[PDB]
Design a protein around this nucleic acid. Sequence first.
DNA 1: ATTCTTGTTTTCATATCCTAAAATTAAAGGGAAAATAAACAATACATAACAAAACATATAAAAACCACCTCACTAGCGCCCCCTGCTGGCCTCTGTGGGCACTGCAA
Length: 100
Amino acid sequence: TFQCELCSYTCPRRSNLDRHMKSHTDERPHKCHLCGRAFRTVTLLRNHLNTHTGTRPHKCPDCDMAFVTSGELVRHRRYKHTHEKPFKCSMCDYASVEVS
DNA sequence: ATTCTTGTTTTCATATCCTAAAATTAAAGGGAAAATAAACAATACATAACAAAACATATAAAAACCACCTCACTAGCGCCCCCTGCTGGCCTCTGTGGGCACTGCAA
Ligand SMILES: [Zn+2]
Ligand SMILES: [Zn+2]
Ligand SMILES: [Zn+2]
Ligand SMILES: [Zn+2]
């Protein structure tokens, strides 16, 4: 029912349309007090500051290294600890942690 | 002298009036059965008052619904070796090409 004007975005929640309009309008009100980089939400700026300094809270349960976000630890476990490999190739027997 | 009209009392007469006995007839008096009316008492209907039940409003009491925030997942593109195999000179060690001095044989 809900439709977009800038693109063919179709959702059922008005709040989803609101966020999509915020993405089109690029409301970035969160700057970094070290570099000119800016973001739209607080968690992005929090991770950016957790990269300018070493304050990595997501610790690896199987080794002693760490990362700022969860997805990086997910893929680290699928590379090094639980070799998942969901996506597989066409001809060869290849598979890896990322679609890239 | 004889004949003829006219006015007035006498007396029958015929209608009327009065009188009384019958009859009679309607009034009127009383006995009694209907009979309408009326005085009183009873029943039913209608009206008013009191009390309660039903209806409507306010309010707040959980409670339901909607929207926003947030903490992750899902894509995304570099990023960075890393390993592995071919490629294109490079160089030096065998190996291809040659000039020429040297020898053994038999004149
Ligand atoms: Zn759009
Ligand atoms: Zn910064
Ligand atoms: Zn680890
Ligand atoms: Zn393949």
